Every structure is written in C-alpha cells, then in structure tokens.
Amino acid sequence: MKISVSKNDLENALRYLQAFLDKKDASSIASHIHLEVIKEKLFLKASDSDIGLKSYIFTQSSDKEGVGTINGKKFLDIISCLKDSNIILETKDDSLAIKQNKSSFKLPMFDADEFPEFPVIDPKVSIEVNAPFLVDAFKKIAPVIEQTSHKRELAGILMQFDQKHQTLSVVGTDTKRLSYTQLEKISIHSTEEDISCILPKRALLEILKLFYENFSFKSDGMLAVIENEMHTFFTKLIDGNYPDYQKILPKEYISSFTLGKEEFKESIKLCSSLSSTIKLTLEKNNALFESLDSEHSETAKTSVEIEKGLDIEKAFHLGVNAKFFLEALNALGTTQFVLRCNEPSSPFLIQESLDEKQSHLNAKISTLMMPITL
Amino acid sequence: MKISVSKNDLENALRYLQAFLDKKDASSIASHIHLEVIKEKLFLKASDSDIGLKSYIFTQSSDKEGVGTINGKKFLDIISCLKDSNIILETKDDSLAIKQNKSSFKLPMFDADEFPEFPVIDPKVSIEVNAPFLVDAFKKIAPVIEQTSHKRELAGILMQFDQKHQTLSVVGTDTKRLSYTQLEKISIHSTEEDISCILPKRALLEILKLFYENFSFKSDGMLAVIENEMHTFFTKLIDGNYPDYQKILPKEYISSFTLGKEEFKESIKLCSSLSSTIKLTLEKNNALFESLDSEHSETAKTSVEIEKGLDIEKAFHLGVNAKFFLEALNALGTTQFVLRCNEPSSPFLIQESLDEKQSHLNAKISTLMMPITL
C-alpha cells in the first residue's frame, strides 16, 4: 500500500471507528482497523461478529493499492498530534509507515486474513430515511432502555414495520415505563406484511453518533445495516419477541391535563434535591409539588399557578418518580404537555400537546409510567 | 435566625464551601456548614482540625441574629435549583427553613456547640500579597507534588521566608524532579530571620480556587491563615524538615541551549503517542526526537530545525521523561526556554529564557530533572 491522505479526513474517520475496537489488548486483532486502498478511496473498517463500521475517505494520491491493518487507538493518537498537512501511509513488510514531512512512525500490522468478514445481507425490509425523524425517535427513547438489561429483548429498541399501513413504530421500555412513537407515511419495502427488528442499545448509541438523515436502513431479520455515502454500519439484532406494548396501553383516560413543560421540569428538579419521588397535587388553578421519599426532617415544596383552569372539581393527587417524569418531559418537543390519567394507582401517560397533529421532520414520543402509591 | 439574602451571593458562597465538607455521611456534623448572622452579615463556615474556610455575604435584610448549621451539599442542591430572586432563611426549632415565593424547604440543624472552633493565630510571619506571583508559583509547581506522598514533608509545597533578604522561595519535589522559584522584594514581617512553612497539597489546590491577588498570608509555624475581604482560609502545616533543595542543584552547567517551547511541546507530545520516554538529540541546527520505551515494532520520530545554531560541535544525546519535560515547559511563561545540561546521566534544568530578568506580576519557575539512561 502507498497513498497520501488529508490529515483531517483521516482523523475524523479514525474518531468514528474508535467505538468499534476492543482497545485494551493491543496484541489482539480486535484492537485493529482493516485498511484497503481501492482506486481513489481508502476504506477503513472495524467490526466483529456483533457490530461494525466500514468507512472511506478519498486519497489525495495513490501509488499502490492493497490491504493492511493497524492498531486503531495508536493510529488516532499519532494522527491527532500531527500537523494539518497531508499524510503518507505506506506499508513496509509487516509494518505500516506513517510520514508527514519531518515526522515518521511505524506500527506493526496483523494478518488481514484473520480480520472478520464484513457482512452483506439480502434485505427483507428496507427504508430510505430522508428526514431526522428516526434518529429523533432513537434519541428520545434511548434513556428508558436498559442496555445491560438482564431480559434479552428489552435490552434493545423495537422497530416494528407495518408495510400495509406504511408505519414504523419505535418502542423502548424498562418495565417501569414505556416510550413509543408511530411514524406514518414511511415508504416501507418489505417481503413480509409485518416485521420486527430489535436493535441492541449499544447499536442505538453508535447510530446516534454516525447518522442523522439521508441514509438507508435495511434488515434481513438477523442483521440491520445502515448506509449513507461515507458509512456502512451493521449490528446483529436481538433474537426473540418484544412484548406487545399495545396491550398495556390504557384504552381511555378519565382525565387529561394540558400543563407547562418547563415549569414542571423546574418544579420537579427543585423537589428532586431532597427526594427521588414526588407527590403531585393538581387543583383547578394550581400544581403543587412535594418531596415524597425524602429523609425524615427534610422537606421540599413548591407550586405553580395554572392560569387556564383544569377540569378538576377537587384536588387530584399523583405519586411520581421524579427522574422518569423529567425524562418523559425531555422527550417532548412542545412548550406544553398533556398528562393523561385514570386512577392514581394506575399507569399514566405523558405526551406532546397536539400529539395527534401530523409532523414531517420529528418524532413525537409518548411515555407511559407507573405511579408511586400515596 | 431570620434573614433574606441574594440567591447568587448565597450560591457562590456555598460552592466555595463544598470542598471543606465530608459529604458522604450526611448524619455527621462534618457534612454541615455553620451559619451565623451578625449585624448585616451572614457568615458561613466549614472546617475541621486540618483545614477550613470562613466566608460571609451581606444580608438583604436581617430581622433576627443567631447561629445554626445545615447540610452543605443539600443546601447548595436546593439553592442552585431556585429562581434568581431573594431567599429567606429562618430557623424554626432544630430546623432551618428556606423560602423563595412559592417554594419552601426544611433541613435539620445540628447542635452548633459540636462544630469545631475556627482557629485564630498569633502570627510569627506575615506577608501581604498584592500581585498574582504567589498563586502563579503555586499553580506552576503543583503538578510535581505527590499529594498522597508517603513521605510527609514532600507531600506539600515549601514556602521558605528569608526576612533579611526579603525573599520567599517556593519549592515542590517528588524526588524525580524539583521545581522552584525565588520571589524577591517581598515585604516579609517575621519574628525569626528564617522560617519555613510546608503547606499540604490539598490546601494548595483549595487556595488556587479561592485566591489570586490582594490577600494576606500569615503563619504561626503550626497553621497558615490566608485572608481577603470575603474569605478566611486556614490549613494545618506539615511538620518536619523539607530537604534543602539548594544542595542538590548543580553549581554550573557545561551546556545551555535556548530552544523553542511550543515546538518542543508539540514534538514531545507527538512521540508520547507511543512511549513515555524520549531520546532527544541536539545538533547544531536540528533537534531530533525519538520514542525510547516504545513497544517492539512501534516507533515515533520527528525533528525540528534550529535556525539560531546551538554551540554544539557534535550531537548531544539526552534521555528524558516525556511527561516531566512537558510539565516543565507548561510551567514557563516565555516563548523560548533554556535547557541546561552537564553529562547525559546528570540532572538537567529547564527554565525560562531570561530567567534572571526581574519580574513583578509573575513567578519564574525552573525545573531540575533526572534524565533516563541511553
């Protein structure tokens, strides 16, 4: 191999690749990036059986095509310390040479034959995503998902494709709370009418660093592959059946209150200084907040005026987990939110104001939560 | 007690005080701030036998004078979540009430009689510091000092007062390296001709957060007390005898090179990607840097042109610790530095260009380092 590349292009590519290396044992090929020069591109890839990323940068020049490998962490450590001028990469036996003017380095290469095959799939389902709605859904739902969940299928995010109705549902839950969204008017190409993909949390978080809009998503029911012009990402899927979240959603709600998002965030954080649970009291023109599981002798109270009177003929009391409530509000894009309730011992829902209104660019996430008793 | 205070004044005061609390066991008075209302001031103090801070803020109003205590971490957690409007603090039995409009809190107080006495000293030495030179010296020397040093006196920074010559010397060492500065034309008031104070590293780091210029420093040989208009800080001193650093400094140096600071930093970091030690080669118009304790098959080299020829008739080779060398350069305020050497196996010195030149506002730190063999 012998090429020259842009320092900043290379550094950026290496930064993305770090998350796909097992970096602690540098003597293992799992700590290495596979390199391949083909025509005017340098491809860099880091993968294992479970997950992987393949990227390219254009070469500034190319004298010799071929393949090699290099420790990804050391490679980035070197590049990040170099000048903003072009870098020469040239193989020399079992070794990769890096040169930039007066600076030169050598790093040992491993046998590229040991490097894992980067998978290709025969997709059963595919979508083209030309707006931020999918990663918006992912980012909004991620906090509810236990990565190290001890239950397999809940350790990931559900993507449920309905080809007939052209809707993709995105769901996360940790059994105390459940966040979901339904994305309509999605052009879904699928061999089956319905197909469900469960992406592991790690994959979710990596996707958020790599992608935003204008990418494809494809799956063969075993792997999911996401591609744009620069990147091809894959992840193994979680096998099994995600619980049907629809069966747990209440059919109707006795009461629905339209409330101020930022005032509630501010009030909940305030009581959270002394407790993890909060007693919320709703009156016609007031919202009261009191610390609930605070130590004896420690109390926090606050209230907020509600100018547009709630349909309440007598105080409604609701015990809530402060962190969950806050996270549900963080997932909302509107200045107001709707709190839908039945009995105080029953699950309640938090969602955007005008959730029913059609949106193009964004996902609207709703969160269903179990209350605290008393 | 009953007063009102400014939220931002209070929050700022509480932030400074956090470092002086043992925060993990909230049931201990060590986690508490002592409060005292005297006339139009609120004094807040956190201290133990070893170290402490006493601060004040002016009250916006004062209805009732008295004393109390409160958990400092909870207090700050509450205040930081409040609005930017005045806060009412009022004692109610064994409890402190905090009110801001619709928000109200209660926290339990402890018996103020258990709170440790804040010490006053009869100073044996005192200085008034009206320029940043002392904290500049402290900040520059701090990195060489082992806080958790297993040797008592080296676990702190030395302040050596010479009343006769009106000089204060500031020294830190960890036995591999030694950084020092001599501050001249300091008005020293002292009962003894010579007196040495050793401040613990923790105290050093706290001082850096609190003080910059226009403060007094006093010591009775047991405690050191630092005061400005807002703060009174104290620390117990480390007992014993700091080694005389003067006896270890070489008398003369065979060679002294004036070199580029930022070029050396950049070159050393570059080789540091692959090693912790570096072989430096000085020639008449070139400085060469090579990784030294890098793994087999991993190498890093770079060089820098030296336009103003060094007085060198044949290459000088010096083995150096990369981190120490970098830290010595970080402590310098000039664009160039002087490297003074004897034999390659002998200690060498790093200091500012024109170190001998008189400076008002700043400390000039020199670092003496043991080289690496080969």
XYZ file of C-alpha atoms in Angstrom:
748
model
C 0.000 0.000 0.000
C 1.103 3.572 -0.674
C -1.126 6.657 -0.569
C -1.386 10.172 0.814
C -4.468 11.447 2.610
C -5.817 14.562 4.262
C -4.978 14.709 7.981
C -8.420 15.973 8.958
C -10.288 13.447 6.799
C -8.200 10.651 8.277
C -8.537 11.884 11.874
C -12.315 12.201 11.543
C -12.603 8.707 10.083
C -10.456 7.295 12.908
C -12.547 9.043 15.550
C -15.731 7.335 14.388
C -14.007 3.976 14.328
C -12.779 4.037 17.936
C -16.098 2.796 19.333
C -15.838 -0.412 17.321
C -12.462 -1.515 18.674
C -11.674 -3.517 21.761
C -8.824 -1.207 22.704
C -7.383 -2.665 25.930
C -5.467 -5.607 24.488
C -3.405 -4.134 21.647
C -1.997 -7.572 20.837
C -5.442 -8.684 19.560
C -6.702 -8.019 16.036
C -9.913 -6.785 17.721
C -7.915 -3.635 18.541
C -7.113 -3.155 14.840
C -8.598 -1.284 11.891
C -8.543 -3.030 8.490
C -7.286 -0.776 5.688
C -7.905 -1.205 1.959
C -6.844 1.043 -0.905
C -9.085 0.654 -3.953
C -8.679 3.168 -6.792
C -9.035 6.628 -5.270
C -10.555 5.517 -1.938
C -9.116 4.341 1.389
C -11.565 2.108 3.237
C -11.187 1.753 6.981
C -13.221 -0.838 8.858
C -13.608 -2.112 12.415
C -16.030 -4.950 13.127
C -16.714 -8.164 14.993
C -19.496 -10.760 14.885
C -21.898 -8.386 16.659
C -21.358 -4.908 15.205
C -19.182 -2.966 12.780
C -18.450 0.156 10.783
C -16.922 0.486 7.320
C -15.993 3.981 6.127
C -13.967 5.559 3.345
C -12.009 8.708 2.639
C -10.743 9.833 -0.758
C -6.992 9.630 -1.250
C -5.013 12.734 -2.217
C -2.756 10.447 -4.202
C -2.466 6.716 -4.771
C 0.664 4.913 -5.962
C -0.024 1.380 -4.801
C -3.236 -0.489 -3.974
C -3.516 -3.176 -1.286
C -4.662 -4.120 2.219
C -3.265 -3.984 5.764
C -4.261 -3.493 9.434
C -3.208 -1.165 12.228
C -3.964 -0.584 15.912
C -6.806 1.942 15.782
C -6.127 3.696 19.077
C -2.415 4.252 18.422
C -3.215 5.303 14.833
C -5.573 8.002 16.063
C -3.214 9.053 18.865
C -0.493 9.659 16.261
C -2.675 11.438 13.669
C -4.270 13.754 16.241
C -0.797 15.027 17.163
C 0.297 15.767 13.584
C 0.186 18.986 11.556
C -2.671 19.961 9.249
C -0.821 18.822 6.134
C -1.159 15.654 4.048
C -0.078 12.287 5.487
C 1.716 9.481 3.684
C 0.699 5.903 4.518
C 2.954 3.191 3.158
C 3.298 -0.485 4.012
C 6.743 -1.929 4.582
C 6.700 -5.701 5.210
C 4.584 -6.454 8.330
C 4.529 -2.775 9.202
C 2.656 0.416 8.345
C 4.740 3.581 7.942
C 3.205 6.995 8.595
C 5.012 10.103 7.319
C 4.368 13.811 7.464
C 7.389 15.909 6.484
C 9.872 15.646 9.368
C 7.706 13.200 11.341
C 7.637 9.447 10.769
C 6.164 6.442 12.571
C 5.958 2.687 12.296
C 3.239 0.391 13.637
C 3.026 -3.387 13.274
C 0.314 -4.888 11.050
C -1.517 -8.190 11.617
C -2.524 -10.825 9.040
C -5.576 -9.286 7.333
C -6.808 -12.859 6.714
C -7.772 -13.041 10.395
C -9.899 -9.900 10.128
C -13.629 -10.770 10.319
C -15.675 -10.725 7.113
C -17.781 -7.562 6.849
C -21.308 -8.922 6.227
C -23.695 -8.192 3.380
C -27.383 -9.009 3.639
C -30.251 -9.885 1.328
C -32.707 -7.408 2.849
C -36.251 -8.461 3.782
C -37.130 -4.917 4.708
C -35.703 -1.581 3.698
C -36.452 2.092 4.141
C -34.881 5.314 2.918
C -34.758 7.924 5.664
C -34.585 11.460 4.312
C -35.538 13.349 7.486
C -34.309 13.325 11.089
C -37.409 11.523 12.414
C -35.840 8.087 13.030
C -32.770 9.256 14.955
C -35.019 11.731 16.767
C -37.131 8.784 17.911
C -33.972 6.857 18.853
C -32.510 9.731 20.863
C -35.802 10.400 22.647
C -36.434 6.796 23.611
C -32.869 5.705 24.447
C -32.940 6.852 28.100
C -35.672 4.374 29.047
C -33.774 1.372 27.698
C -31.590 -0.764 29.974
C -28.532 -1.710 27.912
C -27.310 -4.239 30.449
C -30.906 -5.412 30.816
C -30.994 -8.964 32.060
C -34.009 -9.596 29.860
C -32.862 -10.077 26.262
C -35.441 -8.297 24.089
C -35.934 -5.320 26.420
C -32.219 -4.595 26.210
C -32.896 -3.078 22.797
C -35.138 -0.715 20.864
C -38.048 -2.136 18.884
C -38.604 -1.179 15.242
C -41.945 -2.526 14.074
C -42.658 -2.225 10.346
C -46.210 -2.252 9.001
C -45.845 -2.396 5.205
C -49.601 -2.167 4.585
C -50.145 0.995 6.567
C -46.659 2.374 5.853
C -45.962 2.955 9.519
C -42.889 2.265 11.589
C -43.365 2.047 15.344
C -40.407 2.646 17.644
C -40.655 1.443 21.255
C -38.410 1.226 24.301
C -39.292 0.008 27.791
C -37.689 -0.979 31.104
C -40.919 -2.325 32.696
C -41.476 0.777 34.876
C -42.067 2.968 31.851
C -42.562 2.609 28.130
C -41.894 5.180 25.437
C -43.184 4.842 21.915
C -43.811 6.655 18.686
C -45.601 5.851 15.497
C -44.008 7.170 12.305
C -46.545 7.339 9.498
C -46.224 7.802 5.737
C -42.963 5.887 5.618
C -42.224 4.182 2.307
C -41.588 0.637 3.543
C -40.258 -2.041 1.221
C -40.679 -5.467 2.780
C -41.177 -9.080 1.742
C -43.471 -9.599 4.740
C -46.544 -7.594 5.784
C -45.170 -7.198 9.299
C -41.581 -7.472 10.509
C -39.925 -6.514 13.779
C -36.277 -5.645 14.329
C -34.826 -5.265 17.817
C -31.621 -3.194 17.838
C -29.279 -3.535 20.864
C -28.762 -0.379 22.955
C -25.077 -0.202 22.028
C -26.003 -0.134 18.351
C -28.583 2.552 19.103
C -25.989 4.770 20.748
C -23.481 4.219 17.938
C -26.129 5.032 15.313
C -26.699 8.350 17.059
C -23.032 9.294 16.606
C -22.951 8.343 12.941
C -26.260 9.157 11.332
C -28.854 11.915 11.219
C -30.696 11.989 7.896
C -30.374 10.752 4.306
C -29.390 7.148 4.991
C -30.869 3.761 4.183
C -31.886 1.152 6.741
C -32.094 -2.496 5.734
C -32.553 -5.767 7.566
C -32.678 -9.469 6.801
C -34.168 -10.291 10.192
C -30.714 -11.204 11.509
C -28.611 -8.090 10.973
C -29.520 -4.474 10.396
C -27.392 -2.436 8.005
C -27.418 1.363 7.834
C -25.733 3.201 4.958
C -25.029 6.716 3.717
C -22.351 7.939 1.311
C -19.488 7.703 3.836
C -20.536 4.887 6.200
C -21.820 1.329 6.220
C -22.815 0.316 9.747
C -24.188 -3.034 10.838
C -25.444 -4.618 14.037
C -26.625 -8.058 14.928
C -30.252 -7.922 16.052
C -31.624 -9.220 19.338
C -33.455 -12.514 18.755
C -36.892 -13.140 20.210
C -40.248 -11.470 20.667
C -40.689 -7.963 22.000
C -43.806 -7.770 24.215
C -46.806 -6.168 22.510
C -46.859 -2.690 24.008
C -50.341 -2.050 22.609
C -51.906 -4.496 25.069
C -50.588 -2.484 28.037
C -51.730 0.966 26.893
C -54.978 2.025 28.588
C -57.831 2.411 26.102
C -59.139 5.675 27.516
C -58.163 8.194 30.161
C -60.588 9.685 32.670
C -58.617 12.927 32.887
C -56.279 14.810 30.529
C -54.459 17.965 31.687
C -52.576 20.408 29.438
C -49.647 21.656 31.567
C -46.479 23.753 31.261
C -43.423 21.682 30.350
C -40.601 23.926 31.601
C -42.458 24.895 34.783
C -42.946 21.232 35.587
C -39.277 20.407 34.817
C -38.153 23.261 37.057
C -40.508 22.299 39.898
C -39.647 18.589 39.748
C -35.888 19.239 39.743
C -36.440 21.532 42.708
C -38.082 18.821 44.848
C -35.604 16.268 43.476
C -32.923 17.967 45.512
C -34.263 16.075 48.528
C -36.133 13.046 47.106
C -36.435 10.632 44.170
C -40.227 10.532 44.320
C -42.652 13.434 44.353
C -46.281 13.948 45.333
C -48.000 15.985 42.597
C -51.253 17.707 43.536
C -53.403 19.117 40.760
C -56.085 21.718 41.541
C -58.118 23.906 39.232
C -55.582 26.729 39.071
C -52.566 25.285 40.874
C -49.997 22.496 40.669
C -48.372 21.583 43.964
C -45.152 19.574 44.267
C -43.929 17.906 47.477
C -40.944 15.662 48.168
C -42.177 12.149 48.953
C -39.332 9.750 49.798
C -37.234 12.443 51.486
C -35.469 11.661 54.762
C -37.284 12.448 57.998
C -36.906 16.176 58.781
C -36.094 17.029 55.143
C -38.903 18.534 53.049
C -39.230 20.372 49.721
C -42.410 22.010 48.439
C -43.275 24.298 45.568
C -46.241 25.271 43.463
C -47.080 26.777 40.124
C -50.173 28.792 39.179
C -52.255 27.304 36.350
C -53.914 30.200 34.510
C -56.092 28.108 32.177
C -58.179 26.212 34.727
C -58.016 22.436 34.785
C -61.281 20.448 34.588
C -60.927 19.456 38.251
C -63.683 19.731 40.864
C -61.420 18.536 43.680
C -57.653 18.042 44.088
C -56.043 15.187 42.125
C -53.074 13.556 43.878
C -50.414 11.603 41.938
C -47.214 9.951 43.227
C -44.440 10.073 40.610
C -40.832 9.041 40.021
C -39.025 12.352 39.522
C -36.363 11.112 37.104
C -38.907 9.266 34.943
C -41.212 12.264 34.813
C -38.323 14.537 33.881
C -37.106 12.178 31.193
C -40.620 11.950 29.733
C -40.715 15.752 29.518
C -37.215 15.917 27.977
C -38.505 13.713 25.138
C -41.180 16.290 24.167
C -40.762 18.990 21.532
C -43.659 21.278 22.560
C -43.840 24.030 25.208
C -46.819 22.318 26.828
C -47.551 18.706 27.583
C -50.594 16.579 28.223
C -50.792 14.395 31.276
C -53.431 11.663 30.877
C -54.566 9.788 33.981
C -57.086 7.345 35.350
C -56.849 6.224 38.982
C -53.809 7.447 40.999
C -52.697 3.815 41.293
C -52.994 3.389 37.507
C -50.383 3.992 34.764
C -50.424 7.497 33.319
C -49.293 8.972 30.032
C -47.137 11.969 29.136
C -47.168 13.271 25.573
C -46.818 16.410 23.490
C -49.630 18.890 23.207
C -51.307 18.233 19.819
C -49.623 14.784 19.593
C -52.316 13.858 17.070
C -51.128 16.583 14.698
C -49.115 15.383 11.692
C -45.369 16.098 11.696
C -42.737 15.629 8.979
C -39.274 16.144 10.442
C -39.699 14.985 14.017
C -40.879 12.027 16.060
C -43.492 12.602 18.778
C -42.760 10.349 21.726
C -45.327 9.462 24.401
C -44.348 7.907 27.710
C -46.498 5.623 29.852
C -45.427 5.408 33.519
C -46.388 3.503 36.662
C -47.192 5.907 39.544
C -45.915 5.673 43.133
C -48.518 4.743 45.784
C -49.660 7.638 48.043
C -32.173 33.364 62.898
C -34.140 35.239 60.242
C -32.674 36.977 57.188
C -33.028 37.337 53.435
C -30.096 37.012 51.058
C -29.273 37.212 47.379
C -29.600 33.834 45.636
C -26.432 34.302 43.599
C -24.358 35.528 46.554
C -25.533 32.562 48.600
C -24.990 30.023 45.801
C -21.465 31.304 45.155
C -20.598 31.144 48.849
C -21.957 27.582 49.065
C -19.972 26.497 46.017
C -16.675 27.500 47.610
C -17.586 25.719 50.814
C -18.283 22.314 49.251
C -14.609 21.310 49.226
C -14.411 21.633 53.003
C -17.229 19.212 53.805
C -17.109 15.474 54.227
C -20.249 14.997 52.163
C -20.861 11.224 52.136
C -22.242 10.787 55.644
C -24.957 13.437 55.964
C -25.649 12.348 59.542
C -22.252 13.767 60.631
C -21.676 17.419 61.516
C -18.626 17.203 59.208
C -21.152 17.387 56.350
C -22.546 20.647 57.764
C -21.947 24.365 57.296
C -22.075 26.575 60.412
C -24.185 29.709 59.920
C -24.007 32.924 61.945
C -25.936 36.153 61.460
C -24.109 39.158 62.909
C -25.463 42.628 62.089
C -25.693 42.865 58.306
C -23.515 39.819 57.516
C -24.175 36.080 57.195
C -21.053 34.060 57.947
C -20.818 30.548 56.568
C -18.011 28.255 57.677
C -16.856 24.686 57.081
C -13.780 23.392 58.896
C -12.134 20.536 60.742
C -8.879 20.144 62.676
C -6.855 20.157 59.443
C -8.364 22.801 57.154
C -11.239 25.262 56.887
C -12.927 28.183 55.188
C -14.955 31.006 56.723
C -16.807 33.340 54.352
C -19.503 35.992 54.548
C -22.202 37.518 52.395
C -24.148 40.684 53.168
C -27.786 40.177 54.094
C -30.530 41.908 52.105
C -32.464 42.150 55.340
C -31.977 40.979 58.907
C -34.751 40.536 61.470
C -33.128 38.160 63.923
C -29.492 37.361 64.727
C -28.243 33.921 65.786
C -26.438 30.711 64.821
C -27.325 27.354 63.246
C -25.968 24.582 60.971
C -27.124 22.901 57.780
C -26.016 20.102 55.454
C -23.866 21.944 52.913
C -24.462 19.664 49.940
C -28.257 19.634 50.272
C -28.221 23.405 50.913
C -26.388 24.023 47.654
C -28.513 21.491 45.758
C -31.633 23.411 46.817
C -30.292 26.935 46.167
C -28.922 26.043 42.724
C -32.432 24.998 41.663
C -34.149 28.196 42.833
C -35.052 31.377 40.948
C -32.837 34.459 40.774
C -34.794 36.274 43.476
C -34.040 36.813 47.170
C -34.121 33.864 49.592
C -35.464 33.828 53.133
C -33.559 31.792 55.732
C -35.307 31.306 59.047
C -34.688 28.902 61.912
C -37.603 27.003 63.386
C -36.621 24.844 66.385
C -33.978 22.272 65.298
C -34.638 23.103 61.668
C -33.673 25.647 59.018
C -36.455 26.887 56.727
C -35.657 28.130 53.226
C -38.280 30.172 51.354
C -38.479 31.784 47.956
C -42.002 32.858 46.996
C -43.937 29.661 46.227
C -41.021 27.376 47.147
C -40.185 26.280 50.685
C -37.834 23.747 52.269
C -36.823 22.421 55.651
C -33.497 20.878 56.658
C -32.486 19.621 60.099
C -29.840 21.534 62.071
C -27.248 20.034 64.441
C -26.037 21.383 67.804
C -23.679 24.228 66.830
C -21.768 23.513 70.071
C -20.288 20.435 68.384
C -18.985 22.499 65.468
C -15.166 22.803 65.623
C -13.647 26.088 66.793
C -12.369 28.155 63.858
C -8.748 28.913 64.849
C -7.005 32.256 65.205
C -3.229 32.513 65.288
C -0.586 34.807 66.733
C 1.432 35.097 63.519
C 5.217 34.632 63.514
C 5.390 35.544 59.864
C 3.119 37.537 57.615
C 3.071 38.897 54.095
C 0.658 40.995 52.065
C 0.328 39.688 48.522
C -0.827 42.350 46.085
C 0.104 40.603 42.824
C -0.576 37.164 41.338
C 3.003 35.934 41.867
C 2.354 33.564 44.801
C -0.604 31.688 43.308
C 1.255 31.677 39.990
C 4.116 29.888 41.741
C 1.638 27.522 43.425
C -0.144 26.669 40.179
C 3.125 26.142 38.309
C 4.684 23.895 40.922
C 1.610 21.887 41.981
C 1.925 19.203 39.268
C 5.250 17.929 40.615
C 3.914 17.389 44.130
C 2.607 13.988 45.240
C -0.413 14.691 47.450
C -0.667 11.110 48.650
C 3.116 11.099 49.006
C 4.178 8.506 51.519
C 6.923 10.840 52.679
C 5.428 13.519 54.933
C 7.210 16.767 54.031
C 7.334 16.120 50.275
C 3.559 15.774 50.253
C 3.396 19.562 50.423
C 4.755 22.775 48.946
C 7.608 24.554 50.708
C 7.423 28.275 51.489
C 10.788 29.474 52.748
C 10.890 33.024 54.121
C 14.135 34.992 54.279
C 13.291 38.167 56.222
C 16.774 39.657 55.791
C 16.857 39.406 52.029
C 13.085 39.834 51.638
C 12.789 36.720 49.520
C 10.269 33.919 49.586
C 11.297 30.650 47.963
C 8.628 28.227 46.777
C 9.639 24.610 46.114
C 7.946 21.346 45.197
C 9.556 17.971 44.515
C 8.692 14.288 44.058
C 12.332 13.050 44.046
C 12.468 12.602 40.242
C 12.123 16.322 39.653
C 12.166 19.533 41.630
C 10.567 22.840 40.729
C 11.400 26.066 42.485
C 11.146 29.809 42.317
C 12.613 32.657 44.256
C 10.336 35.653 44.809
C 12.356 38.754 45.617
C 11.421 42.168 47.007
C 8.693 40.711 49.189
C 7.909 42.705 52.323
C 8.270 39.958 54.934
C 7.272 40.536 58.540
C 8.669 37.797 60.751
C 9.824 37.265 64.323
C 12.569 34.940 63.064
C 15.222 35.585 60.400
C 14.294 32.372 58.608
C 11.064 30.383 58.781
C 9.702 27.561 56.650
C 6.065 26.628 56.140
C 5.063 23.413 54.386
C 1.506 23.559 53.009
C -0.255 20.237 52.223
C -1.179 19.648 48.562
C -4.900 19.700 49.350
C -4.532 23.153 50.873
C -2.549 24.234 47.818
C -5.324 23.162 45.472
C -8.006 24.813 47.609
C -6.001 28.057 47.754
C -5.961 28.085 43.961
C -9.772 28.056 43.855
C -10.143 30.833 46.403
C -7.359 33.338 45.982
C -5.499 35.210 43.265
C -4.200 38.563 44.492
C -4.727 41.097 47.289
C -4.765 38.727 50.257
C -2.684 38.313 53.389
C -0.759 35.186 54.338
C 0.129 34.547 57.968
C 1.566 31.644 59.911
C 2.419 30.751 63.486
C 4.511 27.771 62.419
C 1.569 25.445 63.082
C -1.237 26.775 60.900
C -1.260 29.039 57.883
C -4.104 31.523 57.509
C -4.963 33.310 54.264
C -7.402 36.232 54.229
C -9.048 38.668 51.832
C -12.240 40.691 52.253
C -14.598 37.733 51.681
C -12.622 34.694 52.897
C -10.575 33.439 55.820
C -8.899 30.146 54.926
C -6.666 28.064 57.156
C -4.653 24.871 56.878
C -2.612 22.882 59.308
C 1.010 22.779 58.163
C 3.082 19.659 57.578
C 5.512 19.169 60.476
C 9.169 18.406 59.870
C 12.090 19.484 57.732
C 11.905 19.925 53.985
C 15.173 18.777 52.354
C 17.467 21.636 51.331
C 16.938 21.832 47.587
C 19.957 24.119 47.196
C 22.360 21.272 47.972
C 21.045 19.243 45.014
C 21.206 21.984 42.374
C 24.333 21.693 40.208
C 26.651 24.678 40.634
C 27.370 25.140 36.941
C 26.224 23.689 33.643
C 28.572 22.685 30.836
C 25.968 23.443 28.174
C 22.961 25.783 27.949
C 20.652 25.714 24.904
C 17.971 28.304 24.077
C 15.160 26.315 22.399
C 11.589 26.766 21.147
C 8.985 25.981 23.805
C 5.929 25.213 21.652
C 7.940 23.267 19.067
C 9.352 21.101 21.827
C 5.894 20.590 23.414
C 4.475 19.603 20.032
C 7.356 17.239 19.225
C 7.346 15.582 22.657
C 3.574 15.015 22.612
C 3.998 13.532 19.151
C 6.491 10.869 20.296
C 4.490 10.410 23.511
C 1.802 8.753 21.449
C 3.940 5.607 21.514
C 6.232 5.972 24.564
C 6.663 7.570 28.000
C 10.363 8.255 27.492
C 12.048 10.022 24.604
C 15.566 10.208 23.196
C 16.383 13.864 22.451
C 19.259 14.520 20.058
C 20.629 18.039 19.820
C 22.734 19.081 16.811
C 23.879 22.499 15.692
C 20.772 23.279 13.650
C 18.441 20.399 14.491
C 16.567 18.799 17.380
C 15.663 15.158 16.869
C 13.056 13.301 18.930
C 12.699 9.501 19.063
C 10.425 7.258 21.117
C 12.518 5.341 23.652
C 10.436 2.928 25.749
C 8.037 2.134 22.901
C 6.966 -1.465 22.303
C 8.985 -3.545 19.857
C 7.884 -2.714 16.287
C 6.406 0.649 17.347
C 8.483 3.762 16.617
C 7.921 7.536 16.514
C 10.438 10.080 15.239
C 10.357 13.768 14.455
C 12.705 16.698 14.174
C 12.710 20.453 14.295
C 15.105 22.846 12.546
C 17.057 25.151 14.875
C 17.747 28.379 12.970
C 19.997 30.013 15.583
C 22.792 27.442 15.765
C 23.498 25.732 19.061
C 27.068 25.790 20.439
C 27.459 22.081 19.650
C 30.416 20.539 17.812
C 28.894 17.052 17.859
C 25.430 15.630 18.622
C 24.253 15.755 22.255
C 22.003 12.850 23.275
C 19.612 13.104 26.254
C 17.079 10.544 27.541
C 14.015 12.255 29.037
C 10.688 11.510 30.713
C 8.127 12.959 28.301
C 5.507 13.937 30.879
C 8.078 15.610 33.146
C 9.604 17.533 30.267
C 6.174 18.670 29.113
C 5.163 19.731 32.596
C 8.400 21.705 32.988
C 7.602 23.548 29.751
C 3.976 24.173 30.809
C 5.326 25.999 33.878
C 7.187 28.561 31.707
C 5.808 31.930 30.631
C 8.225 32.670 27.752
C 8.143 31.579 24.088
C 11.627 30.102 24.418
C 13.256 28.056 27.123
C 16.759 27.271 28.263
C 17.868 23.709 28.724
C 20.976 23.482 30.932
C 22.924 20.220 30.969
C 26.096 18.544 32.119
C 26.625 14.834 31.441
C 23.696 12.908 29.854
C 23.487 10.839 33.045
C 23.346 14.033 35.140
C 20.312 16.099 36.251
C 19.358 18.877 33.854
C 17.478 22.128 34.251
C 14.597 23.710 32.346
C 13.838 27.391 32.863
C 12.502 30.481 31.136
C 14.613 32.431 28.711
C 15.909 35.491 30.631
C 15.035 33.824 33.984
C 17.491 36.243 35.594
C 15.401 39.218 34.481
C 13.315 40.873 37.208
C 9.543 40.329 37.100
C 6.734 41.907 39.139
C 3.482 40.065 38.487
C 4.649 36.538 37.777
C 6.740 33.749 39.249
C 9.505 32.212 37.119
C 9.717 28.501 37.818
C 12.764 26.363 36.993
C 12.631 22.581 36.947
C 15.517 20.214 37.650
C 15.041 16.673 36.279
C 16.834 13.325 36.348
C 17.464 12.021 32.793
C 16.782 8.493 31.505
C 19.870 6.366 30.723
C 20.628 5.893 26.982
